[PDB]
Amino acid sequence: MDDELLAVLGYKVRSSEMAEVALKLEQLETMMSNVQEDGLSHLATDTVHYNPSELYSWLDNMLSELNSTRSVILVDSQENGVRLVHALMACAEAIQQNNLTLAEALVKQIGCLAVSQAGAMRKVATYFAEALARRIYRLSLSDTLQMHFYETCPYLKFAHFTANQAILEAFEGKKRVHVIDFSMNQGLQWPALMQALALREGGPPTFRLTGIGPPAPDNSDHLHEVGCKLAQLAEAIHVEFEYRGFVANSLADLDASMLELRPSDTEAVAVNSVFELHKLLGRPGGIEKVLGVVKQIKPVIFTVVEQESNHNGPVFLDRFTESLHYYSTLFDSLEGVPNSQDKVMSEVYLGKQICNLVACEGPDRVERHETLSQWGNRFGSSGLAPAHLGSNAFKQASMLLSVFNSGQGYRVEESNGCLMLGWHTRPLITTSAWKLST
Amino acid sequence: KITLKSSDGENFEIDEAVALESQTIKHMIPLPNVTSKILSKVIEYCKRHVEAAEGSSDEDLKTWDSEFIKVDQGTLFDLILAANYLNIKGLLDLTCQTVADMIKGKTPEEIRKTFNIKNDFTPEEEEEVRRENQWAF
């Protein structure tokens, strides 16, 4: 059992390990008294630190080297925002009360308020009313859209670089590697990983890639097209390459037999998935079948990037309330971004997300977001122990938020061996890595 | 003991080990290119560096270089020519550091005016070269 007075302060120290931790602190104090400035500089710049909360392990590393929560942020607004939120909360309860007569007037009422309103609240009100408008009537481009989300918002670049570091660290010491991308999309994560293996000390391995994509008449060959361009890059840096595309309606339609896996000792396997597992919660039993296949693959790492929110509640106005706060923060972050066609197409990308969130039901609704606490419960029951992220990944994400984003207030924080990207103090997304429990 | 004869024809005498500092001379003396004044300057430089070869002395030699480098534009041009011709690493490096310090100057008008360099950029190319290096401006 931990020390409650210290666990409140953010440190997981056993009550029976106090003496050992104090003794190691004494030993560390003496060592830094002896080794002095050069040793301290070594400890600062040549070390990667993992899980600062566990004091025992952090001190051991230093010694061995020297030898439901509702987070809300209120931005400046006007009372018309309160009137808008009052109108928005009026229609959601009226449409939930089976009124369907006051809702038509209330939906019209929201429209008249939005025009007077100015700022980011006008955009959120317009998109929520439209999804509220044609929810009433239900009881009575894509490739360029995800592209426009890359050069405007920092969530995709954060997801790629932070997951690459976890995969890169687990691949050291291996001669043949194989990565499976559940979110292949257009292969924007992998060009950066291939170069890092080229400059790896000891020699690059044989890199094999296998992508899985949603069905389409063109996406069957679009995945083939993607591997055509990645094969051209793997030869300019002298890396052995291999590729194989997939077409599948849902990740639940997969099995380990058709992935064509060599023995894991011969080829190391790393599974990747970015913004994909939340689309699987609409199908009953989907998430349990996929997580039973990843265990069948027996990889060395499985990196998951998701959205930090609770948008999968069993009560409609509960989902409506949380989603309105979360998408209010997102539209507040984009308020200062200079106006561009990438920015315009980014809101349409998110507008389609709002609209599917409240208007649809059953398998048609795919935006079943969950928090890391809920996500960690699913992975833990499968048998996936956490793999902690270090300060090297933290540093790159912090400098990433400094090249493209300058004045916007994005921050990175560490929690439970994970990394979070948020606006000021409000978390938005989380990156976690997992390994089979032994 | 070796005699080098320059464009002036005067047989400047210098010690063999001192003359060995020039790789071209060591490998092979009409010397039709190097003028008498520049040959004298290279002889002085080689003599001083041989005395140094045969810190407080390091900084004294450095300030002596600083004093010797104080020469006009044509003299620096000829020194670069002679250093490249006679394959002397130290003299070429010193004159190069001097000109590099000189070109650590202002906007391109200043560089093109002090060196009398005449640019003929076609305005598409002038503007494009200005934009492609906009980070510096």
Binding site: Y11, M32, A44, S53, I73, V412 | -
Partner: protein
């Protein structure tokens, strides 16, 4: 060997861990390892669900400088369901309501309002004093040396004084108590000076081990040097990082009673509650500050604890914490 018998083991572990981490994070040429400092910092997030009678929410006070504050309020006893977004800025019911404006310590370089040690302190202040707290997130040194914190405090105070939902029904006014810890005490003193200069009427001032110094070496610095978690070397490092270029430790931001400073005679100042630790490396400076308050014609209640080190208020396992909290509650509800 000497600090082990004066504090409990958990407090010793916490302070020693902080000291060794800050030792690692300090570089001799005057630069700070910001990325590793932020990676090692333990933080929390705001929660609108009342836990133990307290709930919190963040407010973006300023966007140009990214100035933020966290508001702690007692749970609405009249209602049963948890508060909504509109219920957050609900007017207070009560004849008199005091609001505490808190500044956190860290020697102008460490910690934040989101830290797990100052969030706990603010929640305990709300629970014990029966008030509302506003915790400011000011800029830090050496990236933002001076006077960035003294401007963040002024902006936060100007914001707090304007909240129509924080007014009291007795006189249609807001009753503000400035509170500071460590360097927060320094910020509190300077912000109280600025508020007294202007029309804002601060009623009280609370200082917990305020950070003041000087050129000369007092007897506590010589006698107590490295004995209890603090050395003069890192004190001088932090003063060098915070202060402007080409200035000594006699700058008024370091010593308020320097000849270059300003006189506190004929000056309206709030009543002060100064808590001075005994086993502190800079105890003499704090006692001199209290004496300079007493001899300037102002009011001050000095609380000198003989066997108190730094950070006694971060854990509720000592008598000093209980005595100080009782005195703060009596000072506030007066």
């Amino acid at each position: 060997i000497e600090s082990r018998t004066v504090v409990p083991l958990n407090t010793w572990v916490l302070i020693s861990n902080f000291k060794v981490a800050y030792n690692i994070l300090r570089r001799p040429d005057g630069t700070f390892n910001r990325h590793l400092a932020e990676y090692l910092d333990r933080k929390v997030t705001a929660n609108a669900n009342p836990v133990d009678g307290v709930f919190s929410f963040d407010v973006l006070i300023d966007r140009r400088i990214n100035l933020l504050s966290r508001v702690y309020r007692p749970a609405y006893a009249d209602q049963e369901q948890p508060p909504s977004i509109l219920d957050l800025e609900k007017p207070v019911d009560g004849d008199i309501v005091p609001v505490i404006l808190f500044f956190h310590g860290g020697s102008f370089a460490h910690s934040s309002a989101n830290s797990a040690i100052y969030d706990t302190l603010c929640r305990r202040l709300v629970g014990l004093c029966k008030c509302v707290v506003v915790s400011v997130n000011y800029r830090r040194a050496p990236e933002n040396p001076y006077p960035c914190a003294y401007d963040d405090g002024w902006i936060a105070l100007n914001w707090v004084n304007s909240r129509s939902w924080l007014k009291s029904k007795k006189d249609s006014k807001v009753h503000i108590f400035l509170a500071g810890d460590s360097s927060g005490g320094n910020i509190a003193h300077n912000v109280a000076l600025r508020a007294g200069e202007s029309g804002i009427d601060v009623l009280g001032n609370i200082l917990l081990n305020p950070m003041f110094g000087g050129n000369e070496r007092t007897e506590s610095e010589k006698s107590l040097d490295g004995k209890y978690f603090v050395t003069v070397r890192d004190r001088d490092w932090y003063w060098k990082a915070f202060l402007p270029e080409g200035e000594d430790r006699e700058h008024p931001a370091c010593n308020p009673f320097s000849p270059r400073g300003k006189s506190l005679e004929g000056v309206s100042f709030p009543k002060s509650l100064v808590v001075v630790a005994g086993l502190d490396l800079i105890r003499d400076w704090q006692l001199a500050y209290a004496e300079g308050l007493k001899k300037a014609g102002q009011e001050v209640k000095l609380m000198h604890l003989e066997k108190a080190t730094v950070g006694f208020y971060l854990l509720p396992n000592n008598n000093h914490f209980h005595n100080v909290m009782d005195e703060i509650s009596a000072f506030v509800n007066a």
